[PDB]
Design a protein around this nucleic acid. Structure first.
Ligand code: MG
Ligand code: ZN
Ligand code: ZN
Lengths: 50, 98, 79, 1358, 49
RNA sequence: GAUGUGUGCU
DNA sequence: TCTGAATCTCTTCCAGCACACATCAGGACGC
DNA sequence: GCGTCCTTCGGAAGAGATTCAGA
């Protein structure tokens, strides 16, 4: 959805954006796993475990 | 924002300031230095007379531009007449010499 | 049909007299009915004046002598 | 039309001549039907009719009655625009003092009547009397009497003897004063007196009197009798919503003045008691003084909410006056404003105007073309058609905009490249696209900033925009010969990723048959971009006389370099892309391409470089993750070791071995040691620690770590940022200057504690505030520089002089700071240089040293040349082209008629502003140097010392015992290759005459704790030092050893001020020891903050540390703190402790001892000997009674004053000193400025010359008159047989050198408008509209560029 | 600044010789000020407003 | 039109 | 006790452009 | 509502006015 510029990270040391990027990628991965396990009808056991 | 020939101020016949009213961007004191550095005298002369304080030259330039003719006949900025009157309002006497 | 004018500056070497010469020529080509000596390519008068400068057949001396021979022809045309 | 402007005082007759009526009622518009009152401030009878061509009563309505005057109300009918060109006047009841000529410092009335300002003000505000025409009494014409003394005068001298008060008394004094008799009496007094202070006072008064007599002015005109009023339309009362009116201030002040004047006139006829009418006259005087210049008195009057309203002077002076707000800079039609975006598809000469903005900008052109094509009929129809935005107005807009350039200007226009001209390209949107290359020149990022687009209207403006201001003609920075359109931060990364090799490939050993085949191979996915191949290439070369001869070979390169070579123009050697192209490499590539091929191939090359950088940067995906910032593994180990050392030192502190001094110093130093070890481990693990397989075994290479890639390429980042990301952050100090004991050991790859972040916030906030509230001074410096040098233009071609300054490479402590090539490129030489085949010339006398000749001198290893300089030029009112040098924006001589004085001022003034608005880009790091302590000679060669005084020590080695010692290394060839500036107290390993091998010291010293090391041995007795009064003594009771600390001028006792702490040396018999060869006793003064660990009456050696002094040399040394130095040099402030020089050469001696301070007399061997100077007893005089001193030799030590250098060592020495100091300040920050600009500013500083003797000329004796007039007068007189006038060049700072110019308009528009206009009006000065600011103000063509020809024709027509 | 008394320093640049003065400002919540301060000649000068 | 506040890019 | 040198006091200066909003204009008294 | 009217708080530098001290 958006293509930023890498060179804006090292000169102005706001490394928090890259860590937020990685953490948001992990969060969206968890959300995608939940959405995949919820799209095909699966019982509450697998969802609760995950 | 952009501004062609529009509305002008009252005390000095300059274009208004701002986007709310139809106003033109200020050609500041630093930009005049940059125009002098290039040596562009005609550009500077049009910048401070014919699209600015001058009244008769401004209308003549407008007619020339919508006449097919790119030519300016500037007079004197009205902000200089304002300065002369404001100095003469004191005890000083400043005037032009033939 | 014009990007930079370095060669035209080489033709008349002041870079300030070039502006005045091109202004005189372009004003003659715009207000006056005078015709360009090079084939115009849907360009403005200033670009054509600069290009005629770079073609070599125009300068301040040439403009003055052309204007003066036109003036003497005009004076003789009164009869 | 006209050619000059004259300014003088206004007589009441002239004021009545200006006026058309006399306002006598304080009635504005009547809060009713918007009609002027009968005789009010707005009056149709006096100024003019309100509506156009309509009489106020309404008896006439059309032009058919123009010129006639009505009968019922008597308002003449004409255009309504005469309401802003016709003034009135107020007949004041009593005379009133003009505040400008009362409080201008000096008060003109004050030194014209020879009275103090207090007495004249007391008279002028009705609190004392003054005596005019005392007569047969003992009261003088200038004596001041109070109320009771006037009562005594009336009872004791109740004759016709008169003594008035108020403004009328001063008017009578001025009117009844003769000027010629007073002037000749002052001449007699000056010629008969002998002192200097009264001489200055009398010459000031006689200057004022001669100015008054010469002009047509009158002293009695300073007191107002008629007060003119501003025209109504220049102080408009605009009606708003409601019955009220605008909060006008001039109208309110006029209301107050007219009310008070009418009240005074009423009371004059009512025969009111003298006290009441006196008070009312005082109130009228105060009101008039408030109208003229409000706030010049004690308290200013205010209209509402205690806001001081603006008087007439308040709208002529200041930043919001008619000069700096409406004349020097104006709001401008055909202008636009919007946000900018990139759009890298453009070319170097194009920008993107929004389609809905160019319709508004080029609107009259659209009207004209529509009327030409017949689609419209009148202006109204075309206007309606355009605002309706039909289907054909876009097809007409594409014709008015085809080749009509526009000017894109960013808001802070620091240097002249901030305004450039682009050919527009219409786009759909609302953002002005801007070519990515020119962002460096504009300093325009794309994070929300806007640019202003202007439309050149006339034909000449378009031709100037295309020929001068087009971006394709601005590829060279006017500040220095470096290119300004350099790839920045993405093209650099693209060309660095493309032109780089790793030891492996998709296909490595394959051999290619051309760059085209290399591109075909890469795009097909058959070989990686970083292969190591042997491609066959054809590199052209123009080594002949402009002929391109090709040579094909087979070079070992990469695929990426072969691809990039395809866009390089024919004419460049191939050893320009066959490397790892960073940013300096690309800049040098563009510079060489511009110097070799020209301008058009350079523009084409820049566009192709940008395209192929963007493409192959996108095809690389050079991201940045969190694994790229690799923290070195040996980081917490270093932290543990350093913390163990810190704990050991902390424990030792409690043992008493180390105090809270050296312990703090060593703990800071060991933390810094750990910092550099961690950073070195990080930067050794980051780049070379990348094991890759050769396909036979492993080996190392340069890393592809993306952080290191964009740090090495020079795209964005530096060593500091990578150190703060992967290593440790550093030592963030406190705002006061105390470095924090525990530096931040965490970086922005791990976290930061709740406390380390708060520590960093101090530095971050100071770095953010420094920009915001300290770019003002750096932007005021450039304004002063522009205003002092606005009137400099190249008005000749060759002044024809053999003079000039000497240029040599600058080496004062390290390697080559700037080689000769940088310091001499593009500057015309003055004398034939000689190779080491001397008496054989190498260059002609007046040849421009361009690039070829400038490397033709490095081949011959030339060390010094004499080149023509701006400061030493000879032409009048200008600078000849040859005396200037290269244009620095084009590769040739500067063309005649160019305003170099502004190109110099902007170039000097915006490394400062740019680097102070960018301070917080690096954060808040100190960036302090290492404060080195050893001198290691780099090359092998002879050693030579100049003006160094060294002594013998216990070990027999020479030790520095001078303050201005200079160590220089000279190689075996015979040239200076290295120099060193060692401090006082430096020990030496080798001396003079013998060569020193490389890798050993020649000079060692301790930077801290400078000593007072002696030269002769003997016992010590403390002279003029007693405990408590001048020194504080502390003694340990165990060992009983004394320890004393000296005091400064602060805590020194009032009775102890005359006490001078020092040290004297005595022998065993108590006699005074002597230095060998001299008779000066060993009286070594002890400066402040000195710590002495020695005892009284002990034996010492010769050359031992007598005392130790802290140096307190701690500072960031950024361009924020580090640029009052530039302003100090330019304004030329005398330093706090100036170094005393010698005024005259000859034999030196000493005169009257202890005349308050020591005295020294210099007696020439042959000439007269009147010179004696009283040297203060502070510092040691380096000259004794056995040497001969030449003028310019330093009697004392310390910083030089940039007036003594000019007076004694000449003009070349002072201009070289200023250039060297300013250039050192700038080079400390890494910014580059060519010295021509600083020399130009120096020349503009040197324009006032003081006359010594008039000779045969017409100049005065001590007058400070402009240098050009003196020079032309001397050239005219010496052409005949008469003798000239001897002068003396004076140095004025850029503020005073601008205030004291010939044209009063420039000084009035620059600074101190009141003090300049008052002096010009008193002196009756006559402007000439000579420079550039005057013509800008008036509204004419400047005599600078394309208008220089017009101004030359105008001058030659008369 | 809270009403009360603040003994400032005016350190450094005053007197152009290095002698640091001392001042004692008495700021009330409402009313006039009572600035006490020293002199380079060791004299106490009251300064009302 | 002038003040007062807030904000953007240097 | 005349007169340079030091000191005290008053004035001038402190960036460039732009945008948004609000408030103001005599308010105190006579009718 | 219409309408006629009489705080203090920076700092740096420079000029120009006063005072010191000293021969
Ligand atoms: Mg920005
Ligand atoms: Zn009438
Ligand atoms: Zn010259």
């Amino acid at each position: 959805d958006i293509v930023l510029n890498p060179l804006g990270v090292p000169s102005r040391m706001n490394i928090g954006q890259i860590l937020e990027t990685h953490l948001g990628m992990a969060a969206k991965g968890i959300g995608d796993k939940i959405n995949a396990m919820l799209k095909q009808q699966q019982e509450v056991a697998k969802l609760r475990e995950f | 924002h952009a501004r062609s020939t529009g509305s002008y101020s009252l005390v000095t016949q300059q274009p208004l300031g701002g986007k709310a009213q139809f106003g033109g961007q200020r050609f500041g004191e630093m930009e005049v230095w940059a125009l002098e550095a290039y040596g562009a005298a005609y550009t500077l002369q049009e910048m401070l007379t014919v699209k600015s304080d001058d009244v008769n030259g401004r209308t003549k330039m407008y007619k020339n531009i919508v006449d097919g003719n790119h030519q300016m006949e500037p007079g004197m900025p009205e902000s200089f007449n304002v300065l002369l009157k404001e100095i003469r309002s004191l005890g000083i006497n400043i005037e032009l010499e033939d | 049909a014009r990007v930079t004018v370095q060669d035209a500056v080489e033709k008349i070497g002041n870079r300030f007299d070039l502006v005045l010469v091109a202004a005189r020529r372009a004003r003659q080509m715009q207000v006056g009915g005078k015709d360009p000596l090079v084939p115009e390519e849907n360009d403005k008068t200033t670009v054509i004046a600069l290009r005629e400068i770079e073609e070599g057949l125009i300068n301040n001396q040439i403009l003055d002598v052309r204007e003066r021979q036109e003036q003497q022809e005009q004076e003789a045309a009164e009869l | 039309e006209f050619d000059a402007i004259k300014i003088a005082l206004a007589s009441p007759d002239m004021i009545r001549s200006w006026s058309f009526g006399e306002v006598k009622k304080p009635e504005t518009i009547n809060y009713r039907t918007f009609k002027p009152e009968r005789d009010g401030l707005f009056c149709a009878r006096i100024f003019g009719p309100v509506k156009d061509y309509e009489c106020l009563c309404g008896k006439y309505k059309r032009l058919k009655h123009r010129g006639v005057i009505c009968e019922k109300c008597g308002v003449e009918v004409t255009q309504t625009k005469v309401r802003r060109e016709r003034m009135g006047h107020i007949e004041l009841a009593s005379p009133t003092a003009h505040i400008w000529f009362l409080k201008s410092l000096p008060s003109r009335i004050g030194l014209l009547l020879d009275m103090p300002l207090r007495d004249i003000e007391r008279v002028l505000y009705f609190e004392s009397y003054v005596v005019i025409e005392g007569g047969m009494t003992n009261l003088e014409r200038q004596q001041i009497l109070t109320e009771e003394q006037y009562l005594d005068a009336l009872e004791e001298f109740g004759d016709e003897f008169d003594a008035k008060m108020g403004a009328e008394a001063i008017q009578a004094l001025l009117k009844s004063m003769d000027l010629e008799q007073e002037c000749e009496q002052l001449r007699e007094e000056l010629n008969e007196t002998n002192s200097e202070t009264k001489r200055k006072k009398l010459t000031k008064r006689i200057k004022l009197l001669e100015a008054f007599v010469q002009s047509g002015n009158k002293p009695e005109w300073m007191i107002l009798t008629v007060l003119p009023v501003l025209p109504p339309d220049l102080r408009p009362l605009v009606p708003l919503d409601g019955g009220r009116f605008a909060t006008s201030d001039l109208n309110d002040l006029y209301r107050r003045v007219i009310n008070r004047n009418n009240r005074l006139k009423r009371l004059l006829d009512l025969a009111a008691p003298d006290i009441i009418v006196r008070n009312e006259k005082r109130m009228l005087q105060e009101a008039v003084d408030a109208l003229l210049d409000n706030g010049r008195r004690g308290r200013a009057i205010t209209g509402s909410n205690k806001r001081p309203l603006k008087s007439l002077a308040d709208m002529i002076k200041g930043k919001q006056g008619r000069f700096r707000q409406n004349l020097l800079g104006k709001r401008v039609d055909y202008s636009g404003r919007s946000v900018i975006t990139v759009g890298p598809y453009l070319r170097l000469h194009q920008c993107g105007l929004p389609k809905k903005m160019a319709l508004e900008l080029f609107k009259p052109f659209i009207y004209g073309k529509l009327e030409l094509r017949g689609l419209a009929t009148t202006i109204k129809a075309a206007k309606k058609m355009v605002e309706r935005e039909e289907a054909v107005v876009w097809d007409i807009l594409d014709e008015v905009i085809r080749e009509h350039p526009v000017l894109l200007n960013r808001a802070p226009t620091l240097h002249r490249l901030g305004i450039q001209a682009f050919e527009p390209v219409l786009i759909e949107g609302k953002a002005i696209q801007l070519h990515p290359l020119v962002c460096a020149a504009y300093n325009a990022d794309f994070d929300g900033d806007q640019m202003a687009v202007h439309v050149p209207l006339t034909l000449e403006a378009q031709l100037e925009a295309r020929a001068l201001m087009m971006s394709t003609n601005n590829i060279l920075s006017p500040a220095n010969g470096e290119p300004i359109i350099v790839p920045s931060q993405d093209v650099v990364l693209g060309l660095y990723y493309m032109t780089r090799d790793c030891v492996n490939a998709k296909g490595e050993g394959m051999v290619l048959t051309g760059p085209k085949e290399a591109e075909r191979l890469y795009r097909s996915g058959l070989a990686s971009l970083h292969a190591r191949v042997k491609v066959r290439i054809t590199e052209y070369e123009k080594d002949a006389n402009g002929e391109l001869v090709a040579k094909t070979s087979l070079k070992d390169t990469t695929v990426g370099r072969a691809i990039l070579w395809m866009i390089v123009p024919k004419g460049l050697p191939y050893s320009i892309v066959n490397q790892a192209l960073g940013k300096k490499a690309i800049s040098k590539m563009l510079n060489t391409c511009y110097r070799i091929l020209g301008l058009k191939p350079t523009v084409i090359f820049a566009d192709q470089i940008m395209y192929t950088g963007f493409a192959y940067a996108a095809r690389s995906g050079a991201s940045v993750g969190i694994d790229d910032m690799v923290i070195p593994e040996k980081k917490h180990e270093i932290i543990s070791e350093a913390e163990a050392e810190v704990a050991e030192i902390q424990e030792q502190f409690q043992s008493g071995l180390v105090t809270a001094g050296e312990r703090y110093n060593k703990v800071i130093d060991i933390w810094a040691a750990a910092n550099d070890r961690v950073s070195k481990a990080m930067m050794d693990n980051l780049q070379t620690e990348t094991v890759i397989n050769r396909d036979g075994q492993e080996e190392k290479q340069v890393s592809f770590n993306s952080i290191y890639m964009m740090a090495d390429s020079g795209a964005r980042g530096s060593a500091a940022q990578i150190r703060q990301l992967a290593g440790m952050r550093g030592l963030m100090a406190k705002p006061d200057g105390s470095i924090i004991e525990t530096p931040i050991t965490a970086n922005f790859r791990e976290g930061l504690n709740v406390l380390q972040y708060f520590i960093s916030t101090h530095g971050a906030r100071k770095g953010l505030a420094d920009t915001a509230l300290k770019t003002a001074n750096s932007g005021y410096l450039t304004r002063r520089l522009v205003d002092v040098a606005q009137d400099l233009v190249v008005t000749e071609d060759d002044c024809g002089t053999h003079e000039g300054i000497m240029m040599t490479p600058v080496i004062e402590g390290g390697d080559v700071k700037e080689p000769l090539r940088d310091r001499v490129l593009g500057r015309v030489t003055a004398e034939d240089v000689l190779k080491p085949g001397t008496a054989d010339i190498l260059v002609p006398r007046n040849t421009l040293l361009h690039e070829q000749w400038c490397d033709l001198l490095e081949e011959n290893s030339v060390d010094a040349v004499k080149v023509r300089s701006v400061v030493s030029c000879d032409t009048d009112f200008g600078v000849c082209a040859h005396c200037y040098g290269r244009d620095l924006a084009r590769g040739h001589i500067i063309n005649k008629g160019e305003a170099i004085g502004v190109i110099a001022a902007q170039s000097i003034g915006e490394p400062g502003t740019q680097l102070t608005m960018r301070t917080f880009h690096i954060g808040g790091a100190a960036s302090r140097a290492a404060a080195e302590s050893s001198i290691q000679v780099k090359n092998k060669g002879s050693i030579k010392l100049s003006n160094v005084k060294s002594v013998v020590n216990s070990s027999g080695k020479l030790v520095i015992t001078s303050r201005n010692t200079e160590l220089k290394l000279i190689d075996e060839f015979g040239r200076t290759k290295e120099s060193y500036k060692v401090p006082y107290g430096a020990v030496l390993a080798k001396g003079d005459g013998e060569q020193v091998a490389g890798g050993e010291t020649v000079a060692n010293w301790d930077p801290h704790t400078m000593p007072v090391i002696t030269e002769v041995s003997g016992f010590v007795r403390f002279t003029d030092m007693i405990d408590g009064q001048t020194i504080t003594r502390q003694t340990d009771e165990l060992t009983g050893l004394s320890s004393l600390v000296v005091l400064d001028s602060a805590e020194r006792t009032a009775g102890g001020k005359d006490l001078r702490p020092a040290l004297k040396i005595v022998d065993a018999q108590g006699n005074d020891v002597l230095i060998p060869g001299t008779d000066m006793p060993a009286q070594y003064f002890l400066p402040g903050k000195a710590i002495v660990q020695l005892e009284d009456g002990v034996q010492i050696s010769s050359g031992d540390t007598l005392a130790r002094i802290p140096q307190e040399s701690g500072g960031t040394k950024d361009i924020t703190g580090g640029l009052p130095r530039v302003a100090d040099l330019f304004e030329a402030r005398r330093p706090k402790e100036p170094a005393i020089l010698a005024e005259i050469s000859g034999i030196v001696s000493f005169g009257k001892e202890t005349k308050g301070k020591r005295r020294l007399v210099i007696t020439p061997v042959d000439g007269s000997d009147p010179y004696e100077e009283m040297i203060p007893k502070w510092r040691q005089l380096n000259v004794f009674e056995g040497e001969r001193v030449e003028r310019g030799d330093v009697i004392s030590d310390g910083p030089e004053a940039p007036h003594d250098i000019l007076r004694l060592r000449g003009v070349h020495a002072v201009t070289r000193y200023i250039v060297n100091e300013v250039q050192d300040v700038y080079r400390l920050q890494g910014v580059k400025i060519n010295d021509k600009h600083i020399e130009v500013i120096v020349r503009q500083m040197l324009r006032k010359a003081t006359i010594v003797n008039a000779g045969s000329s017409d100049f005065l004796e001590g007058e400070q008159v402009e240098y050009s007039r003196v020079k032309i007068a001397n050239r005219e007189l010496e052409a005949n047989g008469k003798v000239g006038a001897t002068y003396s060049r004076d140095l004025l700072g850029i503020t005073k050198a601008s205030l004291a110019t010939e044209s009063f308009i420039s000084a009035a528009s620059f600074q101190e408008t009141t003090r300049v206009l008052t002096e010009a009006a008193v002196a009756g000065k006559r402007d000439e509209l000579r420079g550039l600011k005057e013509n800008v103000i008036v509204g004419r063509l400047i005599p600078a560029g394309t208008g220089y020809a017009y101004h030359q024709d105008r001058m030659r027509r008369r | 600044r809270s009403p009360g008394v603040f003994f400032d320093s005016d350190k450094g640049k005053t007197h152009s010789s290095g002698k640091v003065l001392y001042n004692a400002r008495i700021i009330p919540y409402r009313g006039s000020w009572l600035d006490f301060e020293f002199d380079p000649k060791d004299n106490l000068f009251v300064r009302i407003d």
